[PDB]
């Protein structure tokens, strides 16, 4: 029903956005490791 | 539900695609800097080889 | 895009109003917004120019007929000093025979 | 053109009454019980039979 769709859409956007930002934080870690390897190879 | 599954699938596939695009572009940026470093060491050691040649020739003449 | 489609609908309504036809519903015309706007603007511009020319010509004919014969009679009376630089001729379409 | 523009403007104005869910959407309303088969046949042309 209507309120069921309200609750479901709220949970949808909550869990999908939380997965999105979790993956971008792991992307941040990948960027950090990549420049660490870059500077280690240059030195 | 099924609609949760398909929307989670599409958003997860597009953050996956964002990961792939960003990291491929960043690696293509970094590779040129690393090859610049290696070829700069090549040209640097070539110029220092010319310097060693000048030192040996002037030691010879002296 | 909604404002553009609403402006297209308002221009079509104004074009039908200037055309004299009424808003009768019928089957739609499935096409893009740009081609429909280009098709609408040609007929709307032609009808707007025709209506402006017709209104201006009707107003000009009415204003000419309002003072047609009297201007001719006053020019025939004043055919010697019309724009001579010594005499201004105040003409007045005045009332009945109370000339004193 | 007036018919197609009225239909497109109706769809545009009806989109304003929707509810967004951050790349998610839903619609709610009323419909008579005698049109449940017609509404099901209209929903048969849905993308994933929503």
How is the secondary structure organized here?
This is part of a larger assembly, with 1 copy of chain A (43 residues), 1 copy of chain B (62 residues) and 2 copies of chain C.
Chain A: H1 2-42
Chain B: H1 2-61
Chain C: H1 2-19, H2 33-66, H3 68-77
Summarize the structure.
This is part of a larger assembly, with one copy of chain A (43 residues), one copy of chain B (62 residues) and two copies of chain C. Chain B is mainly alpha-helical and 62 residues long.
Question: What can you see in these coordinates?
Answer:
The PDB classes it as membrane protein. The structure is cut from a larger assembly and holds one copy of chain A (43 residues), one copy of chain B (62 residues) and two copies of chain C. Chain A has one helix spanning 2-42. Chain A has 43 residues and is an all-alpha fold. Chain B has one domain: Single alpha-helices involved in coiled-coils or other helix-helix interfaces, CATH 1.20.5. Chain B is rod-shaped. Chain C has helices at residues 2-19, 33-66, 68-77. The radius of gyration of chain C is 25 Å and the shape is elongated. Chains in contact: A-B, A-D, B-D, C-D.
- Count of β-strands of chain B: 0
**Shape field of chain B:** rod-shaped
The CATH architecture classification of chain B is Up-down Bundle
Relative helix content of chain A? over 70%
How many helical stretches of chain A? 1
Q: Would you tell me the structural class of the helices and strands of chain B? A: mainly alpha
- How far apart lie the N and C ends of chain A? 63 Å
Largest protein interface?
A: A-B, 16 and 19 residues
Percent range for helical residues of chain B? over 70%
Distance between the termini of chain B: 90 Å
Oligomeric state: part of a larger assembly
Q: Evaluate the radius of gyration of chain A.
A: 19 Å
Major sheet size, sense and barrel closure of chain A: none
E-strand count of chain A: 0
**Which structural class fits the helix and strand makeup of chain A?**
mainly alpha
Mind summarizing the main beta sheet of chain B?
A: none
Subcellular location (chain D): Membrane
Family (chain D): Belongs to the V-ATPase 116 kDa subunit family.
Protein name (chain D): V-type ATP synthase subunit I
Organism (chain B): Thermus thermophilus (strain ATCC 27634 / DSM 579 / HB8)
């Amino acid at each position: 029903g209507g309120l069921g769709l309200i609750k479901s859409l709220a949970e949808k956007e909550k869990q999908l956005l939380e997965r999105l930002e979790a993956a971008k934080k792991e992307a941040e870690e990948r960027v950090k490791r990549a420049e660490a390897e870059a500077k280690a190879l240059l030195e | 539900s099924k609609l949760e599954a398909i929307l989670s699938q599409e958003v997860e596939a597009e953050i996956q695609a964002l990961l792939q695009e960003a990291e491929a572009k960043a690696e293509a940026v970094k590779r040129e800097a690393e090859e610049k470093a290696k070829a700069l060491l090549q040209a640097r050691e070539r110029a220092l080889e010319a310097q060693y040649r000048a030192a040996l020739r002037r030691a010879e003449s002296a | 895009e909604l404002r553009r489609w609403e402006a297209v609908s308002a221009g079509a309504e104004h074009t039908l109003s200037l055309l004299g036809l009424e808003a009768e519903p019928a089957r739609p015309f499935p096409e893009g917004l740009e081609a429909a706007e280009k098709a609408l603007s040609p007929i709307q511009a032609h009808a707007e120019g025709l209506t402006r020319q017709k209104q201006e010509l009707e107003e000009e004919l009415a204003l000419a007929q309002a003072y047609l014969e009297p201007l001719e009679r006053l020019a025939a009376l004043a055919h010697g000093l019309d724009k001579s630089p010594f005499l201004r001729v105040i003409p007045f379409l005045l009332t009945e025979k109370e000339l004193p | 053109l007036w018919t197609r523009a009225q239909d497109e403007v109706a769809r545009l104005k009806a989109l304003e009454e929707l509810a967004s869910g951050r790349f998610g959407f839903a619609l709610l309303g009323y419909v008579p019980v005698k049109a449940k088969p017609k509404v099901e046949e209209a929903l048969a042309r849905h993308k994933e039979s929503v």
